[PDB]
Design a protein around this nucleic acid. Structure first.
Lengths: 67, 67
DNA sequence: CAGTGGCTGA
DNA sequence: CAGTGGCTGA
């Protein structure tokens, strides 16, 4: 498909994303902007899995360094 | 000052990033959430380069399919 | 932002 | 989110 291996791949690079919920993610978000804009509740609603949701939401909110 | 290879490396995985503006980016954003929350005008203020800003914001604002 | 976890070997 | 483009060989 026309799904560029850039932002599309970026989704699967997360510890809570697979090709299965990837299609849902990209269809629910514009790109990286909406991807990181998603909330834990949003994730479960799109991914349909609490584990995948928490894992994805986790990385999105994983601070670079703990001071 | 950990800076795990997860969110930190994620920054350097962009077409408009380097290690020099990486320290600026992480200091201006919490993690991925703020990373994608940045605007093209903001990127220039952080990265200090229009090219890097446009390139970084480009990817952030890159549609999964049909860029 | 808007879609469901969209696949898989013989 | 909050820091400046934070480096580099002899």
């Amino acid at each position: 498909e026309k799904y560029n291996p850039g932002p599309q791949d970026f989704l699967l690079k997360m510890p809570g994303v697979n090709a299965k919920n990837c299609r849902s993610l990209m269809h629910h978000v514009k790109n990286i902007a909406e991807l990181a804009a998603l909330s834990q509740d949003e994730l479960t609603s799109i991914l349909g899995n609490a584990a995948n949701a928490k894992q994805l939401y986790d990385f999105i909110h994983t601070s670079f360094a703990e001071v």
